[PDB]
Design a protein around this ligand. Sequence first.
Ligand SMILES: O=c1ccn([C@@H]2O[C@H](COP(=O)(O)OP(=O)(O)O[C@H]3O[C@H](CO)[C@@H](O)[C@H](O)[C@H]3F)[C@@H](O)[C@H]2O)c(=O)[nH]1
Length: 622
Amino acid sequence: GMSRKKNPSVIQFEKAITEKNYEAACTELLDILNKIDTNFGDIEGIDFDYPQQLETLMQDRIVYFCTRMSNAITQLFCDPQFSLSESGANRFFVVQRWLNLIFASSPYINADHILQTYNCNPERDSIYDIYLEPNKNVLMKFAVLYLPESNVNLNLDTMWETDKNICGSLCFALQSPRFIGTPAAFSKRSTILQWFPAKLEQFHVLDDLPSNISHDVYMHCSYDTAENKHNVKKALNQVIRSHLLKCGWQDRQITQIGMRNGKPVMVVVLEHFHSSHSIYRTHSTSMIAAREQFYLIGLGNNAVDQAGRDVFDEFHEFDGSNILKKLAFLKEMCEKNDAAVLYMPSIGMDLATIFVSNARFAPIQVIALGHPATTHSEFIEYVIVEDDYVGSESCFSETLLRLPKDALPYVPSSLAPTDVQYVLRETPEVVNIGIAATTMKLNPYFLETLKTIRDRAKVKVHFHFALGQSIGITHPYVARFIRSYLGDDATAHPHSPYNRYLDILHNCDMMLNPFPFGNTNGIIDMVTLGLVGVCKTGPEVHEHIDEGLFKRLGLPEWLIADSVEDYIERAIRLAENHQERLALRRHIIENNGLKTLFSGDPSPMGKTLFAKLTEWRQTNGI
Ligand SMILES: O=c1ccn([C@@H]2O[C@H](COP(=O)(O)OP(=O)(O)O[C@H]3O[C@H](CO)[C@@H](O)[C@H](O)[C@H]3F)[C@@H](O)[C@H]2O)c(=O)[nH]1
């Protein structure tokens, strides 16, 4: 084959380690992990030999890969000759989420075997305690392999006093994975969310942290269960803001209000906007309905297809990866239009958007809930959101512009099936239960809750998990996590193409929604197949969307659960009462609630926002 760049090689990596060329070794290692990061856990285009038996057995080949990569890393890190640079460590923290999987999808589970070689204290109380010689080289080796699935004891105060920078870097790393679900991982992260924000405020800059997974940090805290999970977002905002000013940022000066073709100018900063992404399917209709009230400049990237740019009076490309340049291009774009309104429909998916959220480009800066969590940023005034999707407003630092239920009509996907065949099984022997859930939405409570349902159900149940983001080397880890709760009563399906995903669900007799962070598109998917399921509701928007959307689709209120314990009774009831279940499905199939989502009056967004530029003009003047 001919190709753009040389593939990373397990063999090169192995050579390096034999030759005790540590520099090459770290390099090959870093290049492997990066490539895996780029492919979301897929290992195609990593070079390694392997027994022919594994040619057609992908899951087995993956495990084989992870085991073999584990062993090489072991041979390397237990070398006491091996000196890790700070830069070196910093780069590893960025890809620690992938290091975790090298071990966790291997039979070895974690790298605690490597940690044990660093202990220097033969007279210690518990094996779970590693005592280190007081030099920095070995501390960084230790931190780097302090993986989510570690059983080794670490105390944050102790560590934080030893080296703020490392301790912070590791806390970043442990919030970074898209699957933080196992008791060991979820508990490491729970603790960090309570302990770290205080310590994070104290940073002036991102210079000494793994800057490149910052956005993962920001997004992922919404998947804990703590009332106050979002606190780390405040602390991070401050650091980013601080880091922005040290770069020589001047907040844009609010003077005039440029008009175009009558209407004032709205700048829309986009993260992941293709007509295929759900950010379009939800928040594109409301954006066009605001061109009658405003003039829309949309700033996205190359990736955005034609149909995506056509939702703007005009669309500009962001010029590359450099954040400061991205902000320069946005400042001049807002000065040149004395722009009135900055709208970001998603904030979190791109780091540069979080930097934007901590500066002044417009007198009315608004977000929506492409990622449904507050920002804890002072430079963000309002949040667009459908009214039936709201729990407590106290969950948000901003002010909630609560729109009617129809204000945000969804454009369906043009992969959506039209000939769908329906499967209402009467008196099935095993009630097959589907769970549409990306990996971020799995945790010990949810899996404990499913274990309980299975134990208590008076009927046989099998869980099929359709696991968005469980790709490549992620999956064996995840599948095991599920087996650890449900043994032979669950199947864990990898990330699949859409039609295949639907085939998995179409095979179920009902579905269950994860909590705390619930589903949206998964419920469209649910009714699309003519199914009913259960969900939880809660104060946070990502808890409550489910409640709302159920109601909007004309499913009854008993399928909605305030407590974990409610969830169980309802789940069981719906698995037990076959005749009830089918009656509810027959309801939904005939009363096609779905088509009502593509219905609605999309104007309210632009109106409510003009109404605020009105109120803003009159309190300040122009
Ligand atoms: O094996 C699989 C599993 C799922 N899918 C499909 O992936 C889609 C992603 O939405 P899904 O409900 O899975 O995740 P969700 O949290 O809603 O993601 C959106 O909301 C997220 C909130 O931040 C946002 O990050 C994200 O971009 C949004 F999509 C959904 O249509 C599934 O039908 C698939 O094709 N194959």
